[PDB]
Structure 1
């Protein structure tokens, strides 16, 4: 990994985000990428501003310069695909900020854990290719063989953590260089546990573990913190349906295209194509999003808000209103 240049930092530092509250739950990132001919430089600046305005980096001896080196090292390792690009992880970073500060989840974690979560947001899909874990295993691709031989089914998640550790071994981009001993260890262990928990094959088990811990006054405090961090990164990662309908609708179009491309390759590759990755099935977005709301996101957000995160009620309100707007699209 080559170092970040004065050219690159300036490219970001000069962006001034006019009429945009990055801390707000309605902050639009799609309209912020259409307000400049350098959407990447804008995104980095959102991430930068988010990270400084928390007041966390400074407390953990992470300079403004290191922090921006880190963000730009991250952005370099994301790809030009429809969904799992840099815009996605900046989205997850900004959304996690709102759950922590507008939803008051910060009250449940240490400053270090809040710092770790905002950082983990940016590393959590590094060098994603627009193909799910399943694709790599069904095609017996090298990464799939390595994961299967290695004994770990989370193909992509382990890849993401490998690159994250790369970026942070170089002090010029190590946002944790200011930590030592237990704190430094916790920052790495929790960043990795969180990324590994983003695998949706573990979705049910991560959710049931967090709810069992929240209902237990005698849960180990360390383990409750860890499961809260994991649930918050998971929350961020399926937060598309908690946003204003047009923002949510845009995210779904990008993710439907990414699914479709995989299913185009799975066909020429001659492997099993599921209904949702098949273009010629031309399934209605309305029904997709209603399906996703009903089976994954509504139950998830309802249960964590009831269990523990009462401050995040608005997510359940917006999911409810977004669903009703899709039902209206159907009814007409």
Structure 2
């Protein structure tokens, strides 16, 4: 890790985001990106403002400068891929901010846990190459073989955690340098547990563990806090369908192009291509979004809201409105 320069910091600090409210559930990152010729600087400035606006870094001895170094170190480890790039992780950070502060989920967590979640959003996909865990295992890729050999099939999530630890090992980019003892341990352990929990292979069991803890008045408190953090990073990570329809659609186009490039490489390597990754099946966006809504996103958001997350009701309302809009794309085709 080459240290961040003053010039790199200045390029972010000049961005004033005139007319954007980064705290708003209708905030539009696509419009923010189009708004200048320096979209990576605007994205960094959004993450910077969200973290300073929370008032959390200040409280844990993270200087403005170390915060901005950390953001730029994360940024340089994201790739030019259609979906799992720096814009996705800034989106998840912004979305988690809304869940915490507009959905009042902050009430369930300590300030340190709120700080860790906002920071975790920015590390949670470090050095993603636009290929899922399945690609690495099916192609017997070196990372795939290492995962199988070491007994953890969360190929990408372990890789993300490794690069997170690497950035935080330098004091100039350690947003947790203000912490010691049990607090520093909780910050690292909770960050890593959250990233590991974004593996969609663990979706069902992460959801069921959170619901069982939330229904249990005698749940271990530390365990309930940890599962709430995991569920909020998962929620941010599958939040695309909770956004205004046109933001939702732009996300779905970006993920479809990424899946298609994976399918192209799978064909090239002669491994199995799922229909959804197959550029030649040209399956409809509308049916794909409704399917993801019915089988994954609507049940997930409805169950966590009903369990205890009552303040996040708007996510369920928007999924319902987005599903009805996709139904109208079908009805009029």
Q: Shared fold by TM > 0.5?
A: yes
Q: Distance in 2 between matches of 1:303 and 1:256?
A: 27
Instruction: Find the residue that maps to 1:226 and give its secondary structure.
Output: helix
Q: Distance in 1 between matches of 2:34 and 2:276?
A: 29
**Shift of residue 201 of structure 1?**
0.1
Instruction: Find the residue that maps to 2:45 and give its secondary structure.
Output: helix
Corresponding residue for residue 182 of structure 2: 182
Corresponding residue for residue 73 of structure 1: 73
Is there any run of 5+ residues in structure 2 with no aligned partner, and where? none
Q: Distance in 1 between matches of 2:181 and 2:151?
A: 30
Instruction: Find the residue that maps to 2:131 and give its secondary structure.
Output: coil
Q: Distance in 2 between matches of 1:58 and 1:31?
A: 30
Q: Distance in 2 between matches of 1:101 and 1:125?
A: 23
**Shift of residue 53 of structure 1?**
0.3
**Shift of residue 71 of structure 1?**
0.1
Q: Distance in 1 between matches of 2:220 and 2:268?
A: 50
TM-score, with length taken from structure 2: 1.00
**Shift of residue 124 of structure 1?**
0.1
Q: Distance in 2 between matches of 1:84 and 1:64?
A: 26
Cα deviations across residues 189-217 of structure 1 (Å, max 9, x unaligned)? 00000000000000000000000000000
**Shift of residue 41 of structure 1?**
0.2
**Shift of residue 37 of structure 1?**
0.2
**Shift of residue 5 of structure 1?**
0.1
Q: Distance in 2 between matches of 1:275 and 1:208?
A: 29
Number of matched residues? Answer: 332
Instruction: Find the residue that maps to 2:61 and give its secondary structure.
Output: coil
**Shift of residue 324 of structure 1?**
0.2
Corresponding residue for residue 111 of structure 1: 111
Instruction: Find the residue that maps to 2:31 and give its secondary structure.
Output: coil
TM-score, with length taken from structure 1: 1.00
Q: Distance in 1 between matches of 2:286 and 2:29?
A: 22
What is the Cα-based RMSD across aligned positions, in Å?
A: 0.2
Q: Distance in 2 between matches of 1:200 and 1:268?
A: 25
**Shift of residue 96 of structure 1?**
0.1
**Shift of residue 91 of structure 1?**
0.1
Q: Distance in 2 between matches of 1:81 and 1:218?
A: 45
Q: Distance in 1 between matches of 2:292 and 2:19?
A: 32
Q: Distance in 1 between matches of 2:274 and 2:14?
A: 45
The answer on 1:272 being equivalent to 2:272 is yes
Q: Distance in 2 between matches of 1:75 and 1:6?
A: 16
Cα deviations across residues 48-90 of structure 1 (Å, max 9, x unaligned)? 0000000000000000000000000000000000000000000
**Shift of residue 132 of structure 1?**
0.2
Query: How does 1:123-138 map onto structure 2 within 5 Å?
Result: 123-138=123-138
**Shift of residue 130 of structure 1?**
0.1
Instruction: Find the residue that maps to 1:280 and give its secondary structure.
Output: coil
Corresponding residue for residue 120 of structure 2: 120
Instruction: Find the residue that maps to 2:20 and give its secondary structure.
Output: coil
Q: Distance in 2 between matches of 1:282 and 1:176?
A: 46
Q: Distance in 1 between matches of 2:233 and 2:141?
A: 28
Corresponding residue for residue 294 of structure 1: 294
**Shift of residue 258 of structure 1?**
0.2
**Shift of residue 229 of structure 1?**
0.1
